């Protein structure tokens, strides 16, 4: 009976599942808050889906991210991709489509690796 939206972010072998539901405003990564993401010089890589679009988008939803695998920087990249596409998917589903593709324009103008990972590599030259 509650609205909930699950998305996935991935880098090299990291994986990050984000559950977005209608809540009080709390963002958690692996149970601890989002302000305790290590290695603390990439905390703004985690913070940029939030600050790109303002915390008033997040002030009614509460996200939680379970991250597994990879190393430090793979984990912060999977976290930020999960946060970004989770917020866009919640806005498609339970808020209006105008806000959904405004969020898509904001994240894609910053970098579209917040929404689409680079998936199949390499090249045979």
């Amino acid at each position: 009976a509650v609205p909930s939206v699950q998305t996935f972010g991935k880098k090299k072998s990291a994986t990050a599942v984000a559950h977005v539901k209608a809540g009080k405003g709390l963002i958690k990564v692996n149970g601890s808050p989002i302000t305790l993401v290590e290695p603390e010089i990439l905390r703004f890589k985690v913070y940029e889906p939030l600050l790109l679009v303002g915390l008033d988008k997040f002030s009614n939803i509460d996200i939680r991210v379970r991250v597994t695998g990879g190393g430090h920087v793979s984990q912060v990249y999977a976290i930020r991709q999960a946060i970004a596409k989770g917020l866009v998917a919640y806005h498609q589903k339970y808020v209006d489509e105008q806000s959904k593709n405004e969020l898509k324009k904001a994240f894609t103008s910053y970098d579209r690796t917040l929404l689409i990972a680079d998936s199949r590599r390499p090249e045979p030259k």
Partner: protein
């Protein structure tokens, strides 16, 4: 193309099992073809069944490279990736250089952090045909693995008496023209299968006056690889030894790419059987 190549493998090995299953029909059809040729009686099993004869009316109008290379044997020239094991030493990178000079239409790929599954996927969707993986032992290159890519066979060889074109002397550059090939006394059926594997990674149809030859000479299950250039003088031929020389021994031939190691083995070297050192191409 993942779904398509999966079910194309599924259909080809279904057809393979069907042909080995009903290839008694091929030979009893040949029996009644030769019995209508020379008017001799039909054996009792064929004389009493009415089905195979009224099918022979249709099957009368039925009737060399092997199954993996048949669709594009002489049509398309190969494309070959040559790569090393992982974190290669410098004599192994020199050897991979020399092997990509050995095969035309072969480029060299740098190996490191390349999982062999997605290296097989990347190779066989960018459309190469062969992959040659080289293994070292402190400089000395010890193995090479030849993989034919549209779900074809991998022959794994071990290299034995390796002398390199770097390690001799500063002798100049190689020829890089499309070479002739010499395949010596590959007499058994495994030898013919390995001849097909080994020669479908050269460009088809060299020139008749092409001056570069490269020989695979089987001498007691030890395929001696030499490369030569020549000029046909007035009394004989004067042969000059360019390029690396070694001896490769086939120790495995299986029927998938490198990535699975669940492929059905066609021939792997039975080393500790009782009759291990009596027969060749065992």
């Amino acid at each position: 193309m993942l779904r398509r190549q999966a079910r194309e493998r599924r259909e080809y090995l279904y057809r393979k099992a069907q042909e080995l299953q009903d290839s008694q029909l091929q030979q009893k059809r040949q029996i009644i073809k030769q019995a209508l040729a020379q008017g001799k009686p039909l054996p009792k099993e064929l004389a009493e069944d009415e089905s195979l004869q009224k099918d022979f009316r249709y099957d009368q109008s039925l009737k060399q490279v092997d199954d993996e290379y048949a669709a594009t044997s002489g049509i398309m020239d190969p494309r070959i990736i040559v790569t090393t094991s992982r974190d290669p030493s410098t004599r192994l990178s020199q050897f991979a250089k020399e092997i990509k000079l050995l095969f035309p239409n072969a480029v060299r790929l740098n190996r490191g952090n390349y999982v062999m599954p997605n290296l097989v996927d990347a190779c066989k969707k960018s459309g190469t045909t062969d992959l040659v993986v080289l293994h070292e032992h402190r400089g000395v290159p010890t193995s090479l693995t030849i993989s034919h890519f549209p779900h074809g066979p991998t022959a794994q060889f071990s290299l034995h008496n390796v002398v390199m074109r770097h390690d001799i002397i500063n002798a100049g550059n190689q020829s890089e023209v499309n070479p002739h090939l010499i395949f010596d006394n590959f007499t058994t059926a495994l030898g013919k299968r390995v001849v097909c594997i080994l020669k479908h990674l050269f460009n088809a149809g060299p020139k008749k006056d092409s001056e570069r030859v490269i020989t695979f000479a089987n001498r007691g299950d030890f395929i001696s690889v030499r490369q030569h250039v020549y000029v046909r003088t007035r009394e004989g031929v004067e042969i000059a030894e360019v390029g690396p020389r070694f001896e490769m021994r086939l120790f495995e031939l299986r029927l998938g790419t490198l990535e699975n190691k669940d492929a059905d083995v066609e021939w792997q070297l039975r080393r500790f059987i009782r009759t291990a050192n009596k027969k060749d191409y065992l």
